[PDB]
RNA sequence: UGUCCGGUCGGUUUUUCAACCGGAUCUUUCCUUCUGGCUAACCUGUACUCCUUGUGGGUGCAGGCGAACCAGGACUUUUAC
């Protein structure tokens, strides 16, 4: 089966980056995926991206900037209790300074810093450094 | 990538972009429905009916022209069989396999195939039960399977 | 990088490839600076003025490098008819 | 038939529209008949950015089909009647919103009524007997969803000049910035 | 195909080449060939991959023999496209 | 950006056609090459000419951009084009390599033929491949004359051309030389076939 | 909170500005709904004026905006996070 569509997409993106492609084609194209992409854009890791309407599920194209290094996805969507966020960041991200840990929460799909600012955490999706 | 075999093909029907009607290809929805009903009465299964519609007449999909599918339409009318079509087919196949086995005691591959078919049927049956079409506490197996079939 | 109030720390602030963005390392023995001389009207290649491109080594290794260069040139305005958007 | 074929009839514009319809009916082969089985829920006016204007004339929805069965000719007639303005025979759609966790079950909504779905329907309507091939949606670096509509290259004579107007209308309806496009 | 493909708009040739599935949007390349038989002057909207011994509207003429893919149009028969 | 002057002269095009710079490549074809202009049937590919010309021009420009002239190391192993290479070298002072390349030429600072280029030029990256590899060890640009079956690994500015050979490679070389001359040199005009000849280059009768 | 001066007796109060986090709303939009308690308020206008030439300002009560709170129904899709 096609489990974690988002994860697959992320993997594809990573592969593309490794190759030195300037853009990616993604099949399934979810809400979560879209959110992630938006977040990335906000941060400054991704160019344009466009949702094709296959009169069906979806189909995204992402413009890679050459800035992404890894665009990871942590596997089961672990339940993060605000203090554990720091730990997670330490585990995943290079440096206290930079990078993000994209985690869904009540407020919306946001990065770790954003969540902290809000004062609202939840379940992790991925990361970007 | 296929349920039972290790053959991972994509022999598949594409479907067109427009959910709306393919303009020129005319007729009427009501007429189509009537035709479907007639087919059902005659004995054609939903898939078969659909195929018929496709082949000679100007229908592409019922989903497009009517809005409704075919099975749903049949149900509305009062024409969908007690056992859903695919399931029925599977049962028939199983029965056939059993018969073959009976005829020829020594046949291992055949037996295996039969077993597989049975398993498939069971799965399907379970699914149906979960849905609520076939009533619960009911196994569609082998001895009574034949009876069910005919 | 920027200590206290500016004061740029960390020298060697690297050449980043034109095609990939990918940082060109200190010992990236494969990466190359192409210099393309600036054109003028009726002959003339304007001495001491270039469009300079950096190509990372990975791309070169791949063989996706020439194409990339061509694309870059097209983007700039050093070519016509060569690199198409769609293939 | 002035304040009759309009569901509920208060406004001047509505009255004018009714009058126009009546005038059209005056001909009477089948057009009149068609008109007799057609009404407006309301009318809405959209200012297009560039001289012209757009008339989103709202239809019940059961009569939408009827309109379509006529439409183009009728639309043309309307245009002729009222110069310097485009007409869109749009459908008055409900949009029963999404219920919250705490909120009340209004015996469920239909997915026909879901906001996105409604928008899609509107789009389908608004662009003429012409038909959409597909839609791109561009999420830009700043953060702006731009819908980009691929139109089917057959016909494309009615839409040709109205694209900007249509986009404007869409924006007014929803908020989304639409753009139109035709492939070779 | 390398680095900067620019993936929203391919050349149509490529699309044609690739599987009826493996393009941007799914879109079939089967057609409703509007066949006319030699007998009666009436048009049958025959889907090109019949899967059936395609009779006329009533008369037993036999229009198309369903080969696995596209149907062989039985004998000297004439057809329009779509 | 560009002058919009050099749009491939008709005469030049004719010459190229005669050479059969563009009837080369054959059946065999590389995925990194969109220099084709329609496949001629049964064991042939036709090469787009304008594109090739543009590439050549670019190469010439690049060459010009190198300031010290005795620097542009031209190379040729395979026999058809060695002469052409030599001619080119003679025309524009840049120490060439006809015949054997010598491994450890651009690396290995002891060798008698220790060159140190800032711009390498090649004919067949299928054959001279070694040279290209060597260059890749020490940060040098590589210009090369690609047939559509030739590898373009560690290659830049790959002038597309027929490497069946005989006339074609030589012709290409000549063209390149001309371009170089035009971009800073004696020749101030794109017109006039001038005192040189193509047939100075080409493979000779042994 | 950084800014713009310390307007000040090393600390404080605004503006020229900021990003950041909320809140109300309006957008085809309900946030659970009512049977009643308090209707705070003026949407008011009943006498119209203590009064710089004024819509600066309030003694003031029949229709009535209820969120300013309760105190009882009605029945909650239920979780996990
Ligand atoms: Mg598969
Ligand atoms: Mg299995
Ligand atoms: Zn007949």
**Domains located in chain A, CATH noted:** 1-68 (3.30.1370.30), 69-129 (3.30.1490.10)
CA–CA gap between residue F198 and residue F190 (Å, rounded): 16
**Helices and strands in chain D, H and E counts:** 6, 6
Q: Report yes or no: B100 and B106 within 8 Å, Cβ to Cβ.
A: no
CATH of E1-82, picked from 3.40.605.10, 2.40.280.10, 3.30.70.920, 2.20.25.100, is 2.20.25.100
The distance between the two most distant Cα atoms of chain E, rounded to a whole number of Å, is: 59
**Which two structure tokens, joined as six digits, stand for D64?**
């939408």
Cβ of D113: how many Cβ atoms within 10 Å? 14
Q: Which residues share a beta bridge with D148?
A: D136, D179
Give φ, ψ of D7 to 5 degrees. Answer: 55, -75
- Gap from CA of A81 to ligand 3 centroid (Å): 76
**Is residue C21 packed enough to be buried (19+ CB in 10 Å), middle (13-18) or exposed (0-12)?**
middle
Residue E70 DSSP one-character state: S
DSSP conformational letter for F110: T
Among all ligands shown, which has an atom nearest to the Cα of E57?
Answer: 3
Instruction: Report the candidate in F129, F20, F135, F147 with the shortest Cα–Cα distance to residue F77.
Output: F129
- Same domain? B50 vs B95: no
Boundary-marking domain end, from B60, B80, B100:
B80
Maximum separation of any 2 CA atoms in chain F, in Å: 52
Please tell us whether the domain made up of F12-206 is placed in CATH 3.40.50.10490. Answer: yes
Structure-token match 């229009």, residue found: E63
The dihedral built from the CA positions of residue F95, F96, F102 and F106, taken in this order, carries a sign that is positive
Q: How many CB atoms lie within 10 A of CB A121?
A: 23
Q: Strands (DSSP E) along chain F, which ranges? A: 72-76, 97-98, 119-121, 142-143
Asked whether strand G has any atom less than 7 Å from the CB of D103, the reply is yes
B119 and B99 fall within a common domain: yes
Q: CA of B100 vs C1' of G7, distance in Å?
A: 104
- Resolution for this experimental structure (Å): 3.8
Long-range CB contacts (within 8 A, 24+) of E62-71: E63/E35, E63/E37, E64/E35, E71/E46
Task: Give chains near C: 3+ CB pairs under 8 A.
Answer: A, E, F
Helices (H), chain D: 12-25, 31-36, 64-70, 72-81, 115-126, 159-173
Ligand 2 centroid distance, CA of B4 (Å): 6
Tell me the residue length of chain B. Answer: 150
CB contact set of B2 (below 8 Å; sequence gap of 6+): B8, B9
Domain boundaries, chain E: 1-82
* Technique used to solve these coordinates: cryo-EM
Task: Measure the CA–CA gap between F106 and B52, rounded to whole angstroms.
Answer: 75
Query: Length of chain F, please?
Result: 206
Q: How far apart are alpha carbons B14 and C87 in whole angstroms?
A: 25
E75 marked ligand binding residue: no
Optimal mutation site among A65, A66, A97, interface C, most CBs of chain C within 10 A: A66
C-alpha dihedral over E46, E49, E52, E53, to 10 degrees?
60
The dihedral region occupied by C70, where left means phi > 0, alpha psi between -120 and 50, and beta the remainder, is alpha
Please report the domains of chain C, with CATH numbers, ordered by start residue.
1-87 (3.30.1230.20)
Helix (H) or strand (E) holding B65: helix B62-65
* A30 near D CB under 8 A: no
Question: Per the annotation, does E59 bind a ligand?
Answer: yes
Burial of D176 per CB tally in 10 Å (0-12, 13-18, 19+): middle
Beta-bridge mates of residue D82: none
Cα angle A4, A8, A12 (rounded to 5 degrees) comes to 170
Sorted by sequence, the CB contacts under 8 Å of residue A10 that are 6+ apart come out as: A36, A71, A72, A73, A126
Tokens of D162: 């109205």
- Classify strands C32-37 and C50-55 as parallel, antiparallel or unpaired: antiparallel
Q: In this structure, are residues D183 and D152 in contact, taking their beta carbons and an 8 Å threshold?
A: no
The domain of B56 spans: 26-80
Spatial separation of the C-alpha atoms in residues D47 and D24, rounded to whole Å: 26
Tell me how many helices (H) and strands (E) chain B has.
Answer: 7, 0
Distance CA B70, CA B8 (A): 29
Q: In angstroms, rounded to a whole number, what is the distance separating the alpha carbons of residues A105 and B29? A: 47
In Å, what is the CA distance from E44 to each residue of E40, E50, E51? Answer: 11, 12, 15
Cα separations in angstroms, A53 against C36, C86, D137, E8: 43, 20, 8, 12
| Helices H / strands E in chain A, number of each | 4, 6
Distance F64 CA to G56 C1' (A): 83
What distance in Å separates the CA atoms of residue A43 and residue D10, rounded to the nearest whole number?
52
CB contact under 8 A, E24 and A23: no
Nearest CA-CA distance, residue D161 and chain B, Å:
23
User: Helix H segments across F35-139?
Assistant: 49-65, 79-91, 129-136
Radius of gyration of chain F (CA): 16
Q: Which of B15, B19, B21, B23 has the highest number of chain D CBs within 10 A, making it the mutation to test binding with D?
A: B23
If asked whether residues B69 and B91 sit together in one domain, one would say no
Neighbours of chain B (3+ CB pairs under 8 A): A, D, E
> Which string of b and e fits E6-44 if b means at least 16 CB within 10 Å?
ebeebeeeeeeeeeeeebbbbbeebebbebbbeeeeeeb
Contact assignment for E5 to C86 by CB distance below 8 Å? yes
Instruction: Judge whether residue A18 contacts strand G, using its CB and a 7 Å cut-off.
Output: no
E56 is in an annotated binding site: yes
Residue D37 near residue D66, CB atoms below 8 Å:
yes
**Interacting residues of B130 by C-beta distance below 8 A, sequence separation 6+:** none
3-state SS string over C50-63?
A: EEEEEECHHHHHHC
Rg of chain D's alpha carbons, rounded to an integer?
18
Q: H-helix or E-strand containing A9?
A: helix A5-19
A57 to chain E nearest CA, in Å?
Answer: 11
Q: Which residues of E touch C66 (CB under 8 A)?
A: none
Give the Å distance between the CA of D136 and the centre of ligand 1: 27
Instruction: Tell me which residues of chain E, numbers 1 to 30, contact chain C at a CB-CB cutoff of 8 Å.
Output: 1-6, 9-11
Given the structure tokens 């019949």, which residue do they identify?
E50
Q: How far is the CA of E22 from the centre of ligand 1 (A)?
A: 13
The answer to whether the C-beta of D56 is closer than 7 A to strand G is no
Q: How many domains does chain B have?
A: 2
Report d(CA B77, CA B79) in Å as an integer.
6
Is E64 assigned to a binding site?
no
């Amino acid at each position: 089966t096609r489990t974690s569509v988002l994860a697959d997409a992320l993997n594809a993106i990573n592969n593309a980056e490794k190759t030195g492609k300037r853009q990616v084609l993604i099949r399934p194209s979810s809400k979560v995926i879209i959110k992630f992409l938006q977040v990335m854009q906000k941060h400054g890791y991704i160019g344009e991206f466009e949702y094709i309407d296959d009169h069906r599920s979806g189909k995204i194209v992402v413009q890679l900037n050459g800035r992404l290094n890894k665009c990871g996805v942590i596997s089961p969507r672990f339940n993060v209790k605000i203090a554990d966020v720091e730990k997670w960041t330490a585990n995943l991200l290079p440096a206290r300074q930079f990078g993000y840990v994209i985690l869904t929460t009540s407020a919306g799909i946001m990065d770790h810093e954003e969540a902290h600012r809000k004062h609202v955490s939840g379940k992790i999706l991925g990361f970007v450094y | 990538g296929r349920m039972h075999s290790k053959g991972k093909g994509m022999s598949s029907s594409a479907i067109p972009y427009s959910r709306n009607a393919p303009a020129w290809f005319k007729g009427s929805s009501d007429g189509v429905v009537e035709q479907i009903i007639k087919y059902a009465r005659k004995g054609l299964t939903p898939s078969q009916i659909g195929v018929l519609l496709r082949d000679a007449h100007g229908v592409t999909q019922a989903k497009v022209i009517t809005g409704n599918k075919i099975l749903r339409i049949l149900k509305s009318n009062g024409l969908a069989p007690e056992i859903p079509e695919d399931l029925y087919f599977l049962i028939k196949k199983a029965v056939s396999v059993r018969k073959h086995l009976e005829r020829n005691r020594k046949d291992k591959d055949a037996k295996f195939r039969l077993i597989l078919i049975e398993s498939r049927i069971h799965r399907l049956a379970r699914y149906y039960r979960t849905v609520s079409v076939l009533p619960p506490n009911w196994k569609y197996e082998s001895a009574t399977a034949s009876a069910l079939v005919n | 990088m920027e200590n206290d109030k500016g004061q740029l720390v960390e020298l060697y602030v690297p050449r980043k490839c034109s095609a990939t963005n990918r940082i060109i390392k200190a010992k990236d023995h494969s990466s190359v600076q192409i210099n393309i001389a600036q054109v003028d009207e009726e002959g003339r290649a304007i001495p001491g003025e270039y469009v300079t491109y950096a190509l990372s080594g990975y791309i070169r290794a791949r063989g996706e490098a020439d194409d990339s260069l061509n694309r870059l040139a097209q983007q700039d305005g050093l070519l016509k008819n060569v690199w198409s958007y769609s293939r | 038939p002035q304040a009759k074929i309009l569901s509920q009839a208060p406004t001047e514009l509505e009255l004018q529209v009714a009058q126009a319809f009546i005038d059209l009916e005056n001909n009477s082969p089948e057009l009149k008949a068609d008109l007799r089985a057609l009404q407006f829920k309301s009318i809405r006016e959209i200012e297009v950015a560039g001289g012209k204007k757009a008339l989103a004339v709202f239809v019940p929805v059961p009569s939408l089909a009827a309109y379509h069965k006529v439409q183009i000719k009728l639309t043309r007639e309307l245009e002729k009647k009222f110069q310097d303005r485009h007409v869109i025979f749009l459908a008055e759609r409900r949009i029963l919103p999404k219920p919250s966790r705490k909120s009340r079950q209004t015996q469920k909504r239909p997915r026909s009524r879901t906001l996105t779905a409604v928008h899609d329907k509107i789009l389908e309507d608004l662009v003429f007997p012409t038909e959409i091939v597909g839609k791109r949606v561009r999420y830009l670096v700043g953060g702006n969803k731009i819908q980009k509509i691929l139109l089917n290259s057959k016909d494309v004579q009615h839409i040709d000049n109205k694209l900007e107007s249509f986009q404007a209308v869409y924006n007014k309806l929803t908020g989304k910035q639409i753009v139109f496009e035709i492939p070779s | 195909m390398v680095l900067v493909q620019d993936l929203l708009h391919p050349t149509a040739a490529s699309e044609a080449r690739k599987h009826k599935l493996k393009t941007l949007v799914q879109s079939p390349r089967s057609h409703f060939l509007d066949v006319k038989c030699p007998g009666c002057l009436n048009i049958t909207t025959v889907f090109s991959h019949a899967q059936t011994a395609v009779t006329c509207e009533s008369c037993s003429t036999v229009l198309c023999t369903p080969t696995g893919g596209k149907a062989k149009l039985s004998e000297g028969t004439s057809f329009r496209r779509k | 950006s560009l002058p919009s002057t050099f749009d491939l002269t008709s005469e030049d095009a004719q010459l190229l056609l005669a050479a059969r710079v563009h009837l080369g490549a054959k059946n065999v074809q590389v995925h990194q090459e969109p220099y084709v202009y329609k496949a001629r049937p049964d064991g042939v590919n036709v090469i787009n000419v304008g594109k090739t010309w543009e590439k050549i021009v670019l190469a010439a420009r690049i060459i010009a951009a190198i300031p010290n002239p005795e620097d542009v190391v031209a190379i040729s192993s395979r026999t058809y084009g060695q002469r052409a290479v030599l001619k080119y070298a003679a025309h524009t002072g840049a120490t060439p390599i006809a015949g054997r390349f010598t491994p450890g030429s651009f690396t290995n600072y002891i060798t008698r033929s220790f060159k140190e280029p800032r711009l390498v030029i090649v004919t067949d990256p299928r054959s001279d491949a070694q040279a290209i590899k060597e260059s890749s060890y020490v940060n040098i640009p590589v210009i090369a004359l690609t047939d559509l079956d030739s590898p373009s690994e560690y290659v830049d500015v790959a002038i597309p051309c027929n490497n069946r050979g005989k006339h074609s490679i030589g012709l290409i070389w000549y063209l390149l030389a001309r371009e170089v001359l035009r971009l800073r040199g004696a020749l101030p005009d794109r017109t006039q076939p001038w005192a040189i000849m193509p047939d100075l280059y080409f493979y000779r009768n042994p």
